[PDB]
Write an enzyme that holds these catalytic residues in place. Structure first.
Site, PDB file in Angstrom:
ATOM      1  N   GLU A   1       1.657  65.612  57.845  1.00 37.99           N
ATOM      2  CA  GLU A   1       2.949  65.289  58.427  1.00 37.99           C
ATOM      3  C   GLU A   1       3.223  63.789  58.350  1.00 37.99           C
ATOM      4  O   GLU A   1       4.333  63.381  58.019  1.00 37.99           O
ATOM      5  CB  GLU A   1       3.011  65.760  59.878  1.00 37.99           C
ATOM      6  CG  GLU A   1       3.007  67.290  60.056  1.00 37.99           C
ATOM      7  CD  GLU A   1       4.348  67.928  59.747  1.00 37.99           C
ATOM      8  OE1 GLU A   1       5.274  67.210  59.298  1.00 37.99           O
ATOM      9  OE2 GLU A   1       4.467  69.152  59.973  1.00 37.99           O
TER      10      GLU A   1
ATOM     11  N   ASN B   1      15.426  65.060  57.766  1.00 37.03           N
ATOM     12  CA  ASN B   1      15.456  66.460  57.359  1.00 37.03           C
ATOM     13  C   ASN B   1      16.809  66.798  56.757  1.00 37.03           C
ATOM     14  O   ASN B   1      17.772  66.044  56.923  1.00 37.03           O
ATOM     15  CB  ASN B   1      15.150  67.390  58.536  1.00 37.03           C
ATOM     16  CG  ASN B   1      13.829  67.077  59.185  1.00 37.03           C
ATOM     17  OD1 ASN B   1      13.738  66.918  60.409  1.00 37.03           O
ATOM     18  ND2 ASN B   1      12.801  66.931  58.367  1.00 37.03           N
TER      19      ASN B   1
ATOM     20  N   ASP C   1      19.012  68.894  57.569  1.00 41.65           N
ATOM     21  CA  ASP C   1      20.081  69.118  58.543  1.00 41.65           C
ATOM     22  C   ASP C   1      20.572  67.829  59.205  1.00 41.65           C
ATOM     23  O   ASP C   1      21.463  67.867  60.059  1.00 41.65           O
ATOM     24  CB  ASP C   1      19.620  70.146  59.612  1.00 41.65           C
ATOM     25  CG  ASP C   1      18.518  69.618  60.543  1.00 41.65           C
ATOM     26  OD1 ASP C   1      17.927  68.564  60.271  1.00 41.65           O
ATOM     27  OD2 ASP C   1      18.220  70.290  61.555  1.00 41.65           O
TER      28      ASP C   1
ATOM     29  N   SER D   1      18.708  65.881  61.082  1.00 41.57           N
ATOM     30  CA  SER D   1      17.756  65.516  62.132  1.00 41.57           C
ATOM     31  C   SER D   1      16.687  64.617  61.544  1.00 41.57           C
ATOM     32  O   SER D   1      16.584  64.489  60.326  1.00 41.57           O
ATOM     33  CB  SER D   1      17.112  66.752  62.741  1.00 41.57           C
ATOM     34  OG  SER D   1      16.475  67.528  61.732  1.00 41.57           O
TER      35      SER D   1
ATOM     36  N   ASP E   1      12.351  63.476  61.804  1.00 41.56           N
ATOM     37  CA  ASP E   1      10.994  63.712  62.319  1.00 41.56           C
ATOM     38  C   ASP E   1      10.330  62.385  62.690  1.00 41.56           C
ATOM     39  O   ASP E   1      10.395  61.453  61.901  1.00 41.56           O
ATOM     40  CB  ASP E   1      10.127  64.422  61.273  1.00 41.56           C
ATOM     41  CG  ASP E   1      10.603  65.824  60.955  1.00 41.56           C
ATOM     42  OD1 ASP E   1      11.317  66.426  61.780  1.00 41.56           O
ATOM     43  OD2 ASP E   1      10.278  66.322  59.864  1.00 41.56           O
TER      44      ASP E   1
ATOM     45  N   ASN F   1      10.724  66.635  65.693  1.00 43.31           N
ATOM     46  CA  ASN F   1      12.096  66.494  65.209  1.00 43.31           C
ATOM     47  C   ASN F   1      13.120  66.434  66.327  1.00 43.31           C
ATOM     48  O   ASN F   1      12.965  67.071  67.389  1.00 43.31           O
ATOM     49  CB  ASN F   1      12.480  67.630  64.237  1.00 43.31           C
ATOM     50  CG  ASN F   1      12.697  68.940  64.936  1.00 43.31           C
ATOM     51  OD1 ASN F   1      13.735  69.155  65.556  1.00 43.31           O
ATOM     52  ND2 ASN F   1      11.720  69.841  64.836  1.00 43.31           N
TER      53      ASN F   1
HETATM   54 CL   LIG Z   1      11.213  72.715  65.601  1.00 44.76          CL
END
Ligand SMILES: [Cl-]
Ligand SMILES: [Cl-]
Ligand SMILES: [Cl-]
Ligand SMILES: [Cl-]
Ligand SMILES: [Cl-]
Length: 129
Positions: A35, A46, A48, A50, A52, A59
């Site tokens: 990650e 991301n 969308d 959003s 992380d 997120n």
């Molecule tokens: Cl999530």
């Protein structure tokens, strides 16, 4: 802060992730590797819109507020920047909410695709724990 593998493992264990919800410590270290590469300052966008944040790439769609993720929640009730600290307390406590949510560690796509079903024990090989 970039953690060493065994350094991260030690902090995660102390913070009680060791077999938390049945997930052995190796799972959490594996997840963190893929990650964030153990980098607490890691951030990734991301699809969308959003973002992380942190060693465990939590997120903003659901779990923290960053003020720029429309139609998002803040279920762990923290500012997303709080997740980039060299201290992983906020990330661990949040991850504990997340993993108890229902899908367990499948919430982390990297864990699902890259750790799940592998020998995760290898990630704490040789660590003093
Ligand atoms: Cl999530
Ligand atoms: Cl490594
Ligand atoms: Cl130290
Ligand atoms: Cl919320
Ligand atoms: Cl993946």
């Amino acid at each position: 802060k970039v953690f060493g593998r065994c350094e991260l493992a030690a902090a995660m264990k102390r913070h009680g992730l060791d077999n938390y919800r049945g997930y052995s410590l190796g799972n959490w270290v594996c997840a963190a590797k893929f990650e964030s590469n153990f980098n607490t300052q890691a951030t990734n966008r991301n699809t969308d819109g959003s973002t992380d944040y942190g060693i465990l790439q939590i997120n903003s769609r659901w779990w923290c507020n960053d003020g720029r993720t429309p139609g998002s929640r803040n279920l762990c009730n923290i500012p997303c920047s709080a997740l980039l600290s060299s201290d992983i307390t906020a990330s661990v406590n949040c991850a504990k909410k997340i993993v108890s949510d229902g899908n367990g560690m499948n919430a982390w796509v990297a864990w699902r695709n890259r750790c799940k079903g592998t020998d995760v024990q290898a990630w704490i090989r040789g660590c003093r724990l």
